[PDB]
From a paper:
SigW is one of ECF sigma factors in the gram-positive model bacterium Bacillus subtilis. Its activity is suppressed by the anti-sigma RsiW under normal growth conditions.
To confirm whether RsiWcyto still binds to SigW in the absence of zinc ions, SigW and RsiWcyto were co-expressed in minimal media that did not contain zinc ions and were co-purified in the absence of a reducing agent and zinc ions to oxidize the zinc coordination motif (SigW/RsiWcytoox). SigW/RsiWcytoox purified in zinc-free oxidation state was crystallized at the same condition as SigW/ RsiWcytoRed/Zn2+, and the structure was determined by molecular replacement using the structure of SigW/RsiWcytoRed/Zn2+ as a template. The final model was refined with R/Rfree values of 23.7/26.8%. This reveals that the absence of zinc ion does not change the overall conformation of SigW/RsiWcyto. The structure of SigW/RsiWcytoox clearly shows that a disulfide bond is formed between C3 and C37. In addition, H30 and C34 recede from the positions required for zinc coordination. Although there is a slight conformational change induced by the absence of zinc and oxidation, the interaction between SigW and RsiWcyto is not changed. In terms of the binding surface area and the number of bonds between SigW and RsiWcyto, zinc coordination of RsiW does not appear to change its ability to inhibit SigW, suggesting that SigW is not activated by oxidation or the absence of zinc in the CHCC motif of RsiW.
Author numbering:
A (entry chain C): 3 to 72
B (entry chain A): 2 to 95, 125 to 187
The structure:
């Protein structure tokens, strides 16, 4: 996969592709199977990382914070 | 926010009970940031508290012009980057979630930070820039590099 279209992959994921350059990227995926696997791996990774957003502070966190103030 | 800034005016005049309201609002996210940066319950909890305690003690130096969450995120962020570096043994010479956590730690802290704020904490490129004190262009670079290192670690899960 050439680096020039990988930059477009990142531009899609940033959410600031130009509509002129949005049609350019889609062409490479269906055709270039090396650029299709690359993009699939990135989206799969992004999706697994987002599933780790469930964490809450410990039960007595704010009592413990108040106790330590000068 | 109107709720928050009204709470900050109250702490600066003496109302310590207003600060608990501030802690209660951000504790999960701040502890989340620290925990996903450090991968360790005892260190994250220590650092997350330190963030709020330092936020309270420095509250008369905070400009109410600016966004309070940015300011708080910046304290926590600096405290966590600080621990990751001093953790490295030679610093002073000169389950599914659990599995992804271990991968997150293999990212250098400059790309770890942007990945956590962007994808776990859902912050804008603008706020990350302000938080880390860098222009939006630099943030985008690190995200791109972070995405890439992250793909290497996670593609086979």
């Amino acid at each position: 996969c050439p680096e020039q279209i990988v930059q477009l992959m990142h531009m899609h994921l940033d959410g600031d592709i130009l509509p002129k350059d949005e049609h350019v990227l889609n062409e490479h995926l269906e055709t270039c199977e090396k650029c299709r696997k690359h993009f699939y791996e990135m989206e799969k990774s992004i999706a697994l990382v987002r599933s780790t957003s469930h964490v809450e502070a410990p039960a007595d966190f704010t009592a413990n914070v108040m106790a330590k103030l000068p | 926010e109107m709720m928050i800034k009204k709470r900050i005016k109250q702490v600066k005049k003496g109302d310590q009970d207003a600060f608990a309201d501030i802690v209660d609002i951000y504790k999960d996210k701040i502890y989340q940031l620290c925990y996903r940066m450090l991968g360790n319950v005892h260190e994250a909890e220590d650092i997350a508290q330190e963030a709020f305690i330092r936020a309270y003690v420095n509250i008369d130096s905070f400009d109410i012009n600016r966004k309070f969450s940015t300011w708080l995120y910046r304290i926590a962020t600096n405290l966590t980057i600080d621990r990751i570096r001093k953790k490295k043994p030679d610093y002073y010479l000169d389950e599914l979630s659990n599995t992804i956590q271990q991968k997150i730690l293999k990212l250098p802290d400059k790309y770890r930070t942007v990945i956590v704020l962007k994808y776990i904490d859902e912050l804008s490129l603008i706020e990350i820039g302000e938080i880390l004190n860098i222009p939006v262009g630099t943030v985008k670079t690190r995200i791109h590099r972070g995405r890439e290192a992250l793909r290497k670690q996670l593609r086979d899960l």
